[PDB]
């Protein structure tokens, strides 16, 4: 943290943050969500980290260079250490990225190495070559070199993501799946794990071996797993929680801007809320059915009437304000809802869905006041505009993500937040073989468009191709876009250091401080 001159710091530097749900895991190679990343950034540090405004900045690597955007060399600071006092070296990164790539790990984020295009990743993921063929090498203890199969000018931007953080080989090999328990874990971030009681709390304490420890102010941070937004607000207002999670309750929000304006933070966020359709499950493998659902959803009612929290009605997957996005607004978005509704009814009727044979399907959502209130509104809208029957089903977070990867769903509430600010952070997830493809969408035309983005060497052609890939997605009606999120949360007046300026919301508790109160 960088404490301003004149600020008086509380004597007690502790923080309690709501984190939306129980984390899937603490192992950086097994996580895929925002709640998991929130804790991960405090415990494990990679090559680059974000500064308080969101810019990629030195983490374990103090400086890096590239040759033709294909060979990237990271110079690691010599005082980086793990919490047991041992040095963080380039060998840790070699081991870690090979473990990520290895099929035996089964990382849900294995494809992140394809997004960066590290040499040999495709063969490694396919079982054709061993993980030791990965194009990374330690030139010495402080020098990590990465070789890509193509020039990727934004490669370094990917490096702030948890799946490319290091894991300590000696703990992983000795304890297997229990390496993340408090007595076994070893960490290299500003904090270390003190306690983990499932469905109750996660408590982290400052890690004195952290290379930037002299600047860390908060000594202890607790993450809670409350998935009720209404309950998070109540415990915030009772004084128990200093920073809520950033999902806001329909029930109370508007009340809060009125009652506690200086505590409500509302900033741009690169995430999109949508209904994910299982594209390989009949009858959702018919484009007419997917298009009808997309058209009959009335976004004005949902965004402006039902939620009304500052979100923008969406017409694409990638948010239009992502760096490099120059998207074409589809013509259906400009139509009236009455025309969208008639066209949707026509399409469903062509699909064989009568009034004696109405389409019936489930809508799966992860436990939450917000998602439940929204799923109920969306089921009504669809019932009324299409005569469709929808059965609502809630699952806890870890189970919900699992169900989506397994394909045992019809339609699901979904939301994707960028991992780096560039349109491929969204678009790479719809690639046929992506480990993040939960829509189970498979399009050779789509895959080709994305592949062509690295064969050109100028931003305009790239941006044009990103726009055509969004159009392909929209033509196939792979998903149902609903709104582009805003990052809305409550933060006590005595929490310093949270700017709200990073659109990826990569907060690090090492940057915060408590003002005396």
- CATH code, domain carrying 137: 3.90.76.10
288: Cβ–Cβ under 8 A, 6 or more apart, which residues?
A: 347, 348, 350, 351
> What Å distances lie between residue 31 and 40, 100, 151, 161, 178, CA to CA?
9, 11, 28, 11, 15
Give the closest residue to 244 by CA, choosing from 258, 232, 254, 252: 232
56-58 vs 48-50, strand pairing mode: antiparallel
Looking at 132, 153, 168, which one is the last position of a domain? 168
The whole-angstrom separation of Cα 393 and Cα 412 is 9
Q: How was this structure determined?
A: X-ray
Report the residue numbers after which the chain has a gap, meaning the C atom sits over 2.5 angstroms from the next written residue's N, or none. Answer: none
Question: What would the two tokens of residue 503 be?
Answer: 């659109």
The whole-angstrom separation of Cα 205 and Cα 192 is 6
The verdict on 378 and 243 lying in the same domain is no
The whole-angstrom separation of Cα 369 and Cα 261 is 22
Looking at 140, 168, 196, which one is the last position of a domain? 168
The verdict on 353 and 499 lying in the same domain is no
How many residues appear in the chain?
A: 517
- DSSP label of 121: H
Element (H, E) at 487: strand 479-490
3-class secondary-structure state, position 360: strand
Question: What would the two tokens of residue 188 be?
Answer: 């290299």
What is the 3 state secondary structure string of 82-107?
A: CCCCCECCHHHHHHHHHHHHCCCCCC
Looking at 116, 134, 168, which one is the last position of a domain? 168
Quote the domain boundaries for residue 388: 271-486
- Please report the resolution in angstroms: 1.8
The verdict on 319 and 384 lying in the same domain is yes
CATH code, domain carrying 328: 3.10.105.10
> What interhelical angle do 229-237 and 369-386 show, nearest 10?
150
Omega into 115 within 30° of 0, i.e. cis?
no
The whole-angstrom separation of Cα 309 and Cα 486 is 8
- DSSP label of 304: I
Give the alpha-carbon dihedral of 383, 397, 483, 330, to 10 degrees: -80
The whole-angstrom separation of Cα 428 and Cα 450 is 8
The verdict on 63 and 183 lying in the same domain is no
Question: What would the two tokens of residue 126 be?
Answer: 């396919």
Count of domains for the chain: 3
Half-sphere exposure of 281 (CA within 13 A, CB side): 16
The whole-angstrom separation of Cα 417 and Cα 503 is 10
Phi, psi dihedral angles at 496 (to 5 degrees): -95, 165
Where helices occur in 176-314 by DSSP H, the ranges are 229-237, 253-259, 287-296, 299-300
The whole-angstrom separation of Cα 46 and Cα 448 is 31
The verdict on 459 and 495 lying in the same domain is no
The whole-angstrom separation of Cα 485 and Cα 247 is 10
Question: What would the two tokens of residue 102 be?
Answer: 């290895």
3-class secondary-structure state, position 383: helix
Which residues are 205's β-sheet partners? 192, 220
């Amino acid at each position: 943290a960088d404490v301003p001159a004149g600020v008086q710091l509380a004597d007690k530097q502790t923080l309690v943050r709501n984190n939306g749900s129980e984390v899937q895991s603490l192992d950086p190679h097994k996580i895929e969500g925002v709640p998991e990343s929130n804790v991960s950034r405090d415990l494990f540090e990679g090559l680059l980290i974000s500064d308080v405004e969101g810019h990629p900045s030195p983490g374990v690597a103090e400086k890096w260079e590239n040759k033709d955007f294909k060979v990237w060399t990271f110079h690691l600071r010599e005082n980086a250490k793990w919490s047991d006092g041992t040095p963080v070296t380039a060998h840790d990164f070699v081991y870690s990225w090979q473990r990520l790539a290895d099929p035996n790990t089964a990382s849900p984020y294995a494809s992140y190495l394809q997004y960066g295009h590290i040499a040999n990743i495709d063969d490694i993921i396919a079982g054709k070559k061993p993980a030791t063929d990965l194009g990374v090498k330690a030139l010495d203890d402080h020098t990590f070199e990465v070789t890509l199969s193509e020039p990727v000018p934004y490669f370094y931007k990917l490096l702030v993501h948890p799946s490319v953080s290091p894991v300590p080989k000696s703990a992983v090999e000795k304890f297997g799946d229990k390496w993340t328990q408090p007595a076994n874990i070893v960490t290299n971030g500003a904090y270390k794990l003190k306690n983990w009681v499932v469905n109750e709390r996660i408590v982290l304490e400052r890690n004195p071996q952290y290379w930037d420890n002299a600047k860390t102010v908060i000594n202890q941070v607790t993450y809670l797993p409350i998935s009720s937004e209404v309950t998070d607000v109540n415990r915030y207002r009772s004084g128990e929680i200093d920073m809520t999670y950033n999902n806001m309750p329909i029930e109370l929000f508007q009340k809060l801007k009125k009652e506690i304006p200086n505590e409500v933070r509302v900033d741009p966020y690169l995430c999109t809320y949508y209904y994910e359709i299982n594209n390989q499950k009949a009858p959702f493998n018919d484009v007419r059915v997917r298009t009808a659902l997309k058209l009959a959803l009335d976004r004005d009612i949902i965004v402006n009437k039902v939620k009304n929290q500052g979100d923008l009605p969406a017409y694409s997957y990638t948010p239009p304000y992502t760096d490099g996005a120059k998207l074409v607004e589809p013509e259906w978005f400009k139509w009236s809802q009455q025309k969208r509704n008639e066209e949707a009814k026509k399409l469903l009727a062509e699909a064989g869905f009568t009034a004696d044979k109405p389409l019936t399907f489930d809508l799966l959502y992860n436990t939450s006041d917000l998602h439940k209130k929204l799923a109920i509104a969306v089921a009504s809208i669809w019932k009324k505009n299409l005569g469709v029957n929808v059965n609502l089903e809630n699952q806890e977070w870890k189970t919900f993500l699992d169900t989506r990867h397994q394909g045992t769903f019809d339609v699901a509430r979904a939301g994707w937040c960028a991992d780096y600010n560039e349109p491929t952070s969204f678009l790479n997830t719809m690639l046929s073989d992506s480990s993040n493809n939960t829509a189970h969408y498979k399009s050779p035309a789509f895959d080709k468009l994305i592949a062509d983005t690295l064969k050109v060497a100028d931003d305009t052609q790239r941006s044009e191709l990103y726009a055509k890939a969004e159009q392909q997605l929209d033509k196939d009606s792979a998903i149902v876009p609903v709104y582009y999120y805003v990052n809305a949360r409550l933060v006590k007046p005595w929490v310093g250091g949270y700017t709200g300026k990073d659109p990826l919301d990569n907060i690090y508790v090492k940057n915060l401080y408590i003002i005396k109160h």
